[PDB]
């Protein structure tokens, strides 16, 4: 198609590997580019961990208000919110919000511990029909993004379909779904990614991700003005291990998609 030739040209000029998945809920049509290839998820996997804790709250009505202790041993490489509460407590809701809106890695590790390990996060993916998502490690080793390594990876097609069920579908209860959407809309880290390639009047909720090998990711649910919402996943990785982040590639991919 026309958009696939532009995405192919964008990939060639960037020197990396680009994966795009678009789901238009107006007619369930999909636009895919390397949609079945595996990409390192990096911090984009935090949406699955937060959604799994939300599913547990459909039975445990007061789970989101449960206090969790933040000890100095719990801090990893990037904990902007958790460092403000060392030797104190954060609720599971505050931890889910920190992991999603600020990409706090300590909050991610606390959510994984609540689910009984990385196997508990992967279990929630299988429970809602995601046979591709796999979480194998905790923060921060899950971001190694080694080429060929299947660990901590998914495909663009699978993540776009799963993200649609979590935010627009009914994989979660009504109250939990609205909480997830509200958290995604209040993200603070995606101004230069998918949001930068879309019109300013469009409301966007997203989760970014970065890692080694220049891995630059962003997944988003998009609400156009007076139009059926969209779900767009953009994954990108590079050959050099110390390659810089390329958030402009994600913005350009979103612009190419939004032209159609
Ligand atoms: C060998 C172990 N090892 C290797 C891989 N790795 C990482 O990939 N860390 C990454 C990391 O911890 N990224 C954070 C994270 O994992 O949510 C935050 N997520 C990004 C995002 O949401 O867009 C951020 C840019 C807001 S930082 C990282 C990437 C670029 C610059 C600094 C840190 C590590 O730091 C690490 O411990």
UniProtKB/TrEMBL annotation:
It catalyses: a beta-lactam + H2O = a substituted beta-amino acid. InterPro entries: Beta-lactam/transpept-like, Beta-lactam_cat, Beta-lactam_class-A, Beta-lactam_class-A_AS, Cefotaximase. NCBIfam families: bla_class_A, blaCTX-M. One of its GO terms (molecular function) is beta-lactamase activity. The gene is blaCTX-M-14. Its EC number is 3.5.2.6. It is an enzyme of class 3 (hydrolase). One of its GO terms (biological process) is response to antibiotic. It comes from Klebsiella pneumoniae. This is Beta-lactamase. Keywords: Antibiotic resistance, Disulfide bond, Hydrolase, Plasmid, Signal. Residues 19-234 form the Beta-lactamase class A catalytic domain. Belongs to the class-A beta-lactamase family. Pfam families: Beta-lactamase2.
